[PDB]
């Protein structure tokens, strides 16, 4: 009989990383696959689904404006529970570390449905950084039957938590599957036109634990850089969270050389990253994409769960102190040795074959294939 | 300033095990303590609160008839979330492995409130046995800042999961704090009067994974034993779950020698256990109580997370197969050597001072005491 697989996800980053897997799953005659979105994000999720031309089988439309963690958890849980009364897949695949990831896993567990965790095992060891992502991924790890770890270090993290080695596979990150298709040699954009010959710093900031004072500190450091370096401009595709938007407007409204724009489609964003001089970000996904692009990243966090990019020299933790961020950005602008150190391209997160590996592992595990795939 | 401590629980077993801790907390002028119940159980919770004379500060009244896991989780989370908007304790203490335990921990975490886990670290390694308790305690363990493990092996379970040693304390189980006060010399009850001279088997059965076929298999075996042995009577205080009640009525409804009764108050239940010939149960708490009483227990499960009781000879895993349960119960009724092997009293789960250790650990952690209390000492450490 055909293996019944359901992907469950709800946000921009999950959708970008899950879309290559959703498309891979469809290529296999022995799999009957379903796509379920919680729509924890609405506009930002639809931007991705539309770009990949993916239409979900089920769309739970849960997003509320300025929603709380309790609200997302309850809404996702209740709606998925209702879904699972009628449709019973053999396995539910969740992604990464959102509240949708955890609620999806929990709803599946409550119906005794098996769970596979895509992007399993990332850790900072700090329950409040990132908040609540660190616990979302740890609690999802308690539920998951199969763990698709992007890297060996992620697998080691799960081993240290007493997970069975034979339930964890090192696949690479599906983000690289997508990234390997988007960059364009001849790329053009109206915003890049007005940047012109100036150095471009690409900025995103949205971590929950960074809202308020930490983000004010980041933005003050950025204002100081722009004021001091005349040949520098910032492009900031601003997250739809109104708390972020308030902070962005407060600091960068009336700035000629900081461009506040709507979130970019992923092909556009990847191409902006490729064109950037360097990146300031607190994004998870951007940290995994940057090494492939050989693009220096100052990570505006006190922690990271991407140590592989740090080892490659691409990623440097800058924290959230104003002066520290200023000094690190100034260094990248004025020290060619430091810039060179941070701008060597490598592929520590994937080779573009992660989706294939995940599906082939599923097929092996359930007895459809006699052989296991290669590891990343 | 006073340390603000809130206990959060909602079911019969949590209330029994948390009651001694609630009362212990009230003793210390250093602590401002609050009691919050979800009332995941209504009647069965109220029975415990009334017995211990505990009046909750907050009662969320969540119980619905035939409620699902998703329902309990959502209702508890939403109501606790609302509570924490208004009241911010320094630490929330949750108990054990119920959906209330997990939802309480999660709600506290969402408000960045510290969590202490009473009865931390119990494991079967099987996510469907017990269901959902194994995962409830595992996920609670991910959230908890402090882990109050009843025994050394529970601490070892947490260490194996990469929990830091300095965050785990071995306290004994608070169940023993309660048990040490309840058994009295000349206990009597109208139901025991009916039993008279006969051997009494005390039965409870309610595990979620046992509902339906497994429980019917248990009950078929038990009905056979009652039929075959005329001097045996069963006392069964039946859980309020309608699903359990249907099965109890189906298999025992016509038997004069199976007493189907309402859930007993804890004082009465403990005294019935003390007077029983042996116990048939799938209860967690009864497994911890029985060694103290030297009472053989056939555990009606395919797993247990009380291995200390198994090693003591008190607990024997019987599974849920009809014939196996019948054979093992028949053995206890007919084999004096086997009965003797299972009826040696010991105290592997506590010495009655668990609640005090928990409170003193809290006071040390937060700087109110210069000294840390000694851990509960087990098995091997006595003797070696
Ligand atoms: C706990 C959790 O799961 N957080 C994830 C969520 O954080 P994020 O900060 O996006 O949190 P939410 O998904 O709750 O969205 C926050 C708020 O932003 C607004 N909003 C968001 C999306 C949208 O399409 N339209 C819109 O209006 C809404 O007011 C919403 O309530 O998404 C991020 C991706 O960007 C992930 O990195 C985070 O791990
Ligand atoms: C997942 C979870 O947390 N399960 C716990 C719960 O299981 P338990 O089997 O009691 O599950 P519930 O707490 O959901 O109660 C089930 C149903 O029983 C009925 N009911 C229950 C209590 C009551 O006072 N009145 C009443 O009418 C209701 O119809 C209720 O919906 O309590 C048991 C103690 O007995 C614990 O061992 C279990 O760990
Ligand atoms: O304007 C943007 C900003 C980011 N991204 C992509 O979104 C993903 C990261 O999502 P986000 O930073 O929202 O969440 P996180 O990764 O931190 O969970 C990465 O693939 C980015 O390339 C995008 O397509 N457009
Ligand atoms: O009729 C009864 C049955 C049990 N108990 C007590 O209830 C606790 C265990 O609760 P339960 O079996 O409902 O749940 P579990 O321990 O399996 O979570 C133990 O302290 C028992 O002594 C009780 O007081 N009256």
From Swiss-Prot, chain A:
Keywords: Cell wall biogenesis/degradation, Cytoplasm, Isomerase, Teichoic acid biosynthesis. Pathway: Cell wall biogenesis; poly(glycerol phosphate) teichoic acid biosynthesis. It catalyses: UDP-N-acetyl-alpha-D-glucosamine = UDP-N-acetyl-alpha-D-mannosamine. Pfam families: Epimerase_2. Its main location: cytoplasm. It comes from the Bacteria. PANTHER family: UDP-N-ACETYLGLUCOSAMINE 2-EPIMERASE. Catalyzes the conversion of UDP-N-acetylglucosamine into UDP-N-acetylmannosamine, a precursor of the teichoic acid linkage unit. This is UDP-N-acetylglucosamine 2-epimerase. It comes from Bacillus subtilis (strain 168).
Swiss-Prot record, chain B:
Pfam families: Epimerase_2. GO terms for biological process: cell wall organization; teichoic acid biosynthetic process. GO terms for cellular component: cytoplasm. Its EC number is 5.1.3.14. Belongs to the UDP-N-acetylglucosamine 2-epimerase family. Keywords: Cell wall biogenesis/degradation, Cytoplasm, Isomerase, Teichoic acid biosynthesis. Its main location: cytoplasm. It is found in: Cytoplasm. Pathway: Cell wall biogenesis; poly(glycerol phosphate) teichoic acid biosynthesis. Transmembrane segments: none annotated. It catalyses: UDP-N-acetyl-alpha-D-glucosamine = UDP-N-acetyl-alpha-D-mannosamine. Catalyzes the conversion of UDP-N-acetylglucosamine into UDP-N-acetylmannosamine, a precursor of the teichoic acid linkage unit. SUPFAM superfamilies: UDP-Glycosyltransferase/glycogen phosphorylase (SSF53756). Changing residue 373 to L: In TS-21; temperature-sensitive, develops, at the nonpermissive temperature (47 degrees Celsius), a coccoid-like morphology, i.e. a phenotype associated with a deficient synthesis of poly(glycerol phosphate) teichoic acid. This is UDP-N-acetylglucosamine 2-epimerase. One of its GO terms (molecular function) is UDP-N-acetylglucosamine 2-epimerase activity.
């Amino acid at each position: 009989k055909k293996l019944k697989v359901m992907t469950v996800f709800g946000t921009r980053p999950e959708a970008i990383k899950m879309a290559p897997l959703v498309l891979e799953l469809k290529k296999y005659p022995e799999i009957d696959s379903y796509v379920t979105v919680t729509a924890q994000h609405r506009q930002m999720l639809d931007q991705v689904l539309d770009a990949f031309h993916i239409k979900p089988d089920f769309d739970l439309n849960i997003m509320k404006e300025r929603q709380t963690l309790a609200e997302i958890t309850s809404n996702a849980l209740v709606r998925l529970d209702e879904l699972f009364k009628d449709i019973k897949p053999d396995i539910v695949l969740v992604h990464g570390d959102t509240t949708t990831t955890f609620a999806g896993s929990l709803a599946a567990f409550y119906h005794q449905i098996a769970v596979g965790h895509v992007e399993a095992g990332l850790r900072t060891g700090n329950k409040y950084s990132p908040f609540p992502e660190e616990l979302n991924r740890q609690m999802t790890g308690a539920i998951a039957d199969l763990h698709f770890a992007p890297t060996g270090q992620a697998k080691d993290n799960l081993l240290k938590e007493n997970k069975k080695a034979d339930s964890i596979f090192v696949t690479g990150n599906t983000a690289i599957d997508a990234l390997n298709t988007t960059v364009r040699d001849g790329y053009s954009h109206p915003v890049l036109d007005q940047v012109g010959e100036d150095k471009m710093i690409l900025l995103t900031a949205h971590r929950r634990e960074n809202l308020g004072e930490p983000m004010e500190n980041m933005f003050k450091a950025i204002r100081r850089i722009v004021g001091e370096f005349e040949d520098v401009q910032v492009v900031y595709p601003v997250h739809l969270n109104p708390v972020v938007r308030e902070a962005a407007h407060k600091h960068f409204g009336d700035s000629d050389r900081v461009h506040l724009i709507e979130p970019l489609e992923v092909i556009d964003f990847h191409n902006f990253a490729a064109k950037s001089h360097f990146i300031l970000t607190d994004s998870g996904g951007v940290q995994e994409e940057a090494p492939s692009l050989g693009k220096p990243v100052l990570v505006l966090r006190d922690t990271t769960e991407r140590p592989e990019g740090v080892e490659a020299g691409t990623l440097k933790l800058a924290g959230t102190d104003e002066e520290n961020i200023y000094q690190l950005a100034k260094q990248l602008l004025t020290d060619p040795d430091e810039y060179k150190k941070m701008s060597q391209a490598s592929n520590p997160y994937g080779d573009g074959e992660a989706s294939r590996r995940i599906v082939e592992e599923l097929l092996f595990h359930y007895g459809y294939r006699k052989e296991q795939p290669d590891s990343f």
